[PDB]
Amino acid sequence: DFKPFAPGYAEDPFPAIERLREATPIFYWDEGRSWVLTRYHDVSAVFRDERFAVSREEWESSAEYSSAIPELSDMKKYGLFGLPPEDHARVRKLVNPSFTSRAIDLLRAEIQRTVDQLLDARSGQEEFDVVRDYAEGIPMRAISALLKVPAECDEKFRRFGSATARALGVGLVPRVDEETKTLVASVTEGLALLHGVLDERRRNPLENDVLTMLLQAEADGSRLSTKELVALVGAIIAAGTDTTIYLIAFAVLNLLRSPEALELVKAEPGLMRNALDEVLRFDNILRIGTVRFARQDLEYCGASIKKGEMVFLLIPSALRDGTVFSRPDVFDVRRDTSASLAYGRGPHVCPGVSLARLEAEIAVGTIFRRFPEMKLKETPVFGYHPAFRNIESLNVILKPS
Ligand code: HEM
Ligand SMILES: C/C(=C\c1csc(C)n1)[C@@H]1C[C@@H]2O[C@]2(C)CCC[C@H](C)[C@H](O)[C@@H](C)C(=O)C(C)(C)[C@@H](O)CC(=O)O1
């Protein structure tokens, strides 16, 4: 039984996937039209198995997929998930330096400012929603600061980011939870806006600037094409928005749920970094996981997988694998989290890992330092986002009494 859209699954998928993981390393998911890998070692292996491709054009349903949401056709083919291996490496080699911990450190001040202003704006009420009043307003500001886009454009870009991430699932994953017209509008509006931002930066290039750097790469030799560049910036916005919102929300939730964990991070603020990694290890935000496609017929974990068939890596399951993490069903902010696959492995490893950790460190660190007695008002509400165990609301009382 695998029903990742069943009511309750997002809130707590662990009993259901544990049953799966213990019974089998692999199964075919009817509605998902793909194989599903449940165990750490098989999941981890596939990340680094060149037999399994990332490009959706290797899928048996590629035609149906490329035709869906034609406004995103360029992003699908020239984006990081679509480029051929040689081109993918080129693009990553080009942008990776811009995302190191050192490079993104400069954003520290602006992120703190945003976090400060969100807390000042709303901390006074009876009720505070860690999603809508806090987490939701942080990640795009971070990305926009990195892109040197005015705070005025934040809301429109966040809408683009969140819409794009869902739209990319249409025809690929089972149940995208929104009206197509609305999705396409936000995507169109966002791409237009992005075009304007890029044209302006071409007009006024800047020093030590990611976009300027990309634009110069595009102008000079053959290091980056216009479509690759647009697909890259679009993907950065779409990949880095909702993911980070849920990290922040899940972090606060999990620290409210473990007084012992919270107490350790209060005692040793230096543990926050490890705690945030353990949030994704213990309670991974992905509903199912990520996908790969078989480039040829092969046998795997006792299954006969055919060329072009999709495979889902069941991340929240692999990350509860007891052969890899001891006491895997315990949230332990002191554990070694090195083996967590939350940010991927191999050439496609998430470039935003440092930016995400920084944003969450500032956001989660600040809220608990400023309101150390914060308490859950009532059970968080979860939704049916096709990719995420999305928290819709996380209502708290900042200073209870
Ligand atoms: C906040 C928590 C985040 C998580 C849990 C996360 C997770 C992941 C994972 C698992 C992958 C690999 C998917 C695969 O291999 O199929 C990935 C890739 C990617 N991530 Fe993140 N990410 C996060 C934040 C960010 C941020 C903040 C950005 C941008 C600022 C970002 C940009 C990207 C991009 C562009 C890719 C595609 C990489 C490639 O295919 O070469 N992510 N992310
Ligand atoms: C938009 C995007 C990445 C990207 C880079 S280049 C390109 C095109 N897209 C982000 C990545 C994000 O870090 C994770 C969870 C990537 C999550 C990994 C996989 C790819 C997703 O869960 C996948 C099956 C999905 O459910 C959909 C709905 C298709 C995704 O949009 C979810 C989604 O939001 O994907």
Residue whose CA is closest, atom 3 of ligand 2?
Answer: 239
Task: Ligand 2 pocket test: pick from 52, 55, 280, 290 the residue with the most ligand atoms within 8 Å of its Cβ.
Answer: 290
The residue to which tokens 């930066």 are assigned: 201
State the Cα–Cα distance between residues 218 and 329, nearest whole angstrom: 47
Pick the closest to residue 316 from 87, 23, 120, 43 (CA basis).
43
Does the domain at residues 1-401 carry the CATH identifier 1.10.8.60? no
- Resolution of the deposited coordinates, in angstroms? 1.9
CB within 8 Å of 207: residues ≥ 6 apart: none
State the Cα–Cα distance between residues 158 and 156, nearest whole angstrom: 6
Pick the closest to residue 95 from 240, 203, 248 (CA basis).
240
Binding site membership of 319 for ligand 1 (Cβ less than 6 Å): no
Q: Provide the CB-side half-sphere exposure for 139 (13 A, CA).
A: 31
Residue whose CA is closest, atom 23 of ligand 2?
Answer: 290
Question: Per DSSP, what are the bridge partners of residue 162?
Answer: none
Task: Ligand 1 pocket test: pick from 146, 243, 314 the residue with the most ligand atoms within 8 Å of its Cβ.
Answer: 243
CA 197–ligand 2 middle distance (angstroms): 24
Atom of ligand 1 nearest to the CA of 355: 27
State the Cα–Cα distance between residues 5 and 19, nearest whole angstrom: 17
Binding site membership of 79 for ligand 2 (Cβ less than 6 Å): yes
Q: Is 165 annotated as a binding residue?
A: yes
Q: Is 302 annotated as a binding residue?
A: no
